[PDB]
Design a binder for this molecule. Structure first.
Ligand SMILES: CCCCCCCCCCCCCCCCCC(=O)OC[C@H](COP(=O)(O)OCCN)OC(=O)CCCCCCCCCCCCCCCCC
Lengths: 63, 57
């Protein structure tokens, strides 16, 4: 292979590895924020579904 | 002129007209917390695949 091909094949390789490296760092910081604040799709621990509640009038009024 | 109600009359659910206004927050509820911001958009392939260590796919 000529030096030009290897040279520019290297730039292609470095672009992919740099982009992957940045995403790896970003994911660690996103995971840190999502877990601490609970405001994202990850670390979304379930709460009781509200469709289970019955809103019909009860046997007694104060409820 | 009092007529005795029939069997089943007094257990009927009836409608009643009232001039009292329907209560607004009978449970005295606080404001509900806002929902988590919805994630929407077009699902695109993962950028450079899994990106797990050396794997290229
Ligand atoms: C396993 C072979 C190596 C044997 C020695 C053991 C080495 C240590 C094993 C630990 C794991 C290290 C494996 C390192 C490679 C994994 C990363 C990788 O290869 O990238 C993802 C790979 C796609 O490879 P890619 O770069 O896109 O090239 C495509 C070429 N068509 O996609 C993959 O991840 C799948 C590739 C796994 C590598 C083996 C499969 C290659 C395909 C040949 C299968 C055989 C087909 C012939 C069947 C013959 C039947 C008799």
């Amino acid at each position: 292979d000529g030096p030009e091909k290897n040279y520019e094949r290297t730039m292609a390789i470095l672009q992919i590895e740099a982009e992957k490296a940045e995403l790896r760092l970003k994911e660690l910081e996103v995971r840190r924020l999502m877990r601490a604040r609970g405001d994202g799709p990850w670390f979304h621990y379930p709460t009781i579904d509200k469709e289970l509640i019955d809103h019909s009038p009860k046997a007694t009024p104060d409820n | 002129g009092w007529v005795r109600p029939d069997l089943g009359d007094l257990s009927k659910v009836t409608k009643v007209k009232t001039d009292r206004p329907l209560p607004e927050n009978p449970y005295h509820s606080r404001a509900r917390p806002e929902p988590n911001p919805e994630v929407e958009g077009d699902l695109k392939p993962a950028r450079h695949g899994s990106r797990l260590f050396f794997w290229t796919m």
